[PDB]
């Protein structure tokens, strides 16, 4: 019934993603959270980038130990560039029984008005914003706030670190780390 | 064996913030090892319903046993009365006269530093290390080394508050530490 949705390139997946998923899953009492991998946008595309194959494997190794965490390949499967609205439009139909909670960073709530079909989107899913404790998102949109201790880690940051041969311990699952060294990613 | 880091705290309970900081400062300043220094229970708190020192100690043990370069320094838990950082470092200074201690403190706490007992004298015994978020560096007249570490706002107080209210703490501290907290019923009532 109540399913959370976390989008991203998950290149690579990390503890920040798991923490956010877990906090929201409990704070709002969802039955499960789906990680919705986004395809690497055209302007970032090029060789030397991670294959979809690898990202999905890291994501599975990252969500392996959690039965209430799943991977929703719906956006990555469909043709190419999908506005968030379209993806959610297609999911609502395939699962009319589910009330999706789209999870985003509080930093993003400031740009929702620039999101494609944002108006209609709000009719398809319930937005959940993430904010540091002691803060609430004040916005004209009906958005749900969930306070979560800040963990300044991102896929971008991790790729940069693996390039500088810098330590990434405690930043992401050890399974993902092994996989990264084994296949020499971001090297 | 010159460069040794030190991280003080209640470790009630220890959590990933401790581990991340210890790891980051370790590689950053190329330390020989990092010692976690459990604080002694405040005398005005003796008798309340606070976690036993031994429990804090076993959890810290559980949190650091898979790490070669991490260890526990019991200096402060050797004296029953009130504990002051100056005396502890003075004592450690004598037991290990060849070691160059790097006291690691949070970016926030940097402001309270002038209010530390015998701070002037302590500054001669240790090289302070402030953890800062990338970009925003700390500003103090005191000579302290800066180390940028990705923020992870987790504290023992937070974890204590959460367990009492029976709120989730997943990914905020080691599973072996959580197992121990469960099996022994810490943080309840």
Short mmCIF file of N, CA and C in Angstrom, two decimals, chain B residues 84-87 105 109-126 128 140-144:
data_model
loop_
_atom_site.label_atom_id
_atom_site.label_comp_id
_atom_site.label_asym_id
_atom_site.label_seq_id
_atom_site.Cartn_x
_atom_site.Cartn_y
_atom_site.Cartn_z
N UNK B 84 39.78 15.23 34.15
CA UNK B 84 40.13 16.47 33.43
C UNK B 84 41.13 16.14 32.34
N UNK B 85 40.90 16.64 31.14
CA UNK B 85 41.78 16.34 30.02
C UNK B 85 43.26 16.67 30.21
N UNK B 86 43.54 17.76 30.91
CA UNK B 86 44.93 18.12 31.12
C UNK B 86 45.72 17.05 31.87
N UNK B 87 45.16 16.55 32.95
CA UNK B 87 45.84 15.54 33.76
C UNK B 87 46.03 14.21 33.02
N UNK B 105 39.10 16.67 18.05
CA UNK B 105 37.85 17.21 18.55
C UNK B 105 36.98 17.68 17.40
N UNK B 109 32.91 21.85 19.07
CA UNK B 109 33.67 21.97 20.31
C UNK B 109 34.87 22.93 20.26
N UNK B 110 35.38 23.22 19.07
CA UNK B 110 36.52 24.12 18.95
C UNK B 110 36.30 25.46 19.68
N UNK B 111 35.06 25.96 19.68
CA UNK B 111 34.75 27.22 20.35
C UNK B 111 34.90 27.16 21.86
N UNK B 112 34.52 26.03 22.45
CA UNK B 112 34.59 25.83 23.90
C UNK B 112 36.00 25.58 24.44
N UNK B 113 36.93 25.30 23.53
CA UNK B 113 38.32 25.01 23.88
C UNK B 113 38.93 25.97 24.91
N UNK B 114 38.76 27.29 24.73
CA UNK B 114 39.34 28.22 25.71
C UNK B 114 38.82 27.98 27.13
N UNK B 115 37.64 27.37 27.23
CA UNK B 115 37.03 27.09 28.53
C UNK B 115 37.44 25.74 29.14
N UNK B 116 38.46 25.10 28.56
CA UNK B 116 38.93 23.83 29.09
C UNK B 116 39.95 24.09 30.19
N UNK B 117 39.83 23.33 31.27
CA UNK B 117 40.71 23.47 32.41
C UNK B 117 42.18 23.34 32.04
N UNK B 118 42.96 24.36 32.41
CA UNK B 118 44.40 24.38 32.16
C UNK B 118 44.72 24.27 30.68
N UNK B 119 43.82 24.78 29.84
CA UNK B 119 44.01 24.71 28.39
C UNK B 119 45.37 25.17 27.88
N UNK B 120 45.85 26.30 28.40
CA UNK B 120 47.15 26.84 27.99
C UNK B 120 48.21 25.74 28.14
N UNK B 121 48.24 25.13 29.33
CA UNK B 121 49.20 24.08 29.64
C UNK B 121 48.96 22.83 28.82
N UNK B 122 47.70 22.51 28.54
CA UNK B 122 47.38 21.33 27.74
C UNK B 122 47.87 21.49 26.31
N UNK B 123 47.85 22.73 25.82
CA UNK B 123 48.27 23.03 24.45
C UNK B 123 49.74 22.67 24.22
N UNK B 124 50.50 22.59 25.30
CA UNK B 124 51.91 22.25 25.20
C UNK B 124 52.10 20.74 25.18
N UNK B 125 51.09 20.01 25.64
CA UNK B 125 51.16 18.56 25.69
C UNK B 125 50.59 17.86 24.46
N UNK B 126 49.68 18.52 23.75
CA UNK B 126 49.08 17.87 22.58
C UNK B 126 48.79 18.77 21.39
N UNK B 128 46.18 19.61 18.82
CA UNK B 128 44.75 19.44 18.57
C UNK B 128 44.45 19.24 17.09
N UNK B 140 40.11 29.77 14.97
CA UNK B 140 40.47 29.94 16.38
C UNK B 140 41.90 30.48 16.47
N UNK B 141 42.20 31.24 17.54
CA UNK B 141 43.56 31.78 17.69
C UNK B 141 44.52 30.66 18.09
N UNK B 142 43.95 29.53 18.51
CA UNK B 142 44.74 28.38 18.90
C UNK B 142 45.21 27.63 17.66
N UNK B 143 46.49 27.20 17.66
CA UNK B 143 47.10 26.47 16.55
C UNK B 143 46.60 25.02 16.47
N UNK B 144 45.58 24.78 15.66
CA UNK B 144 45.07 23.42 15.54
C UNK B 144 44.98 22.95 14.09
#
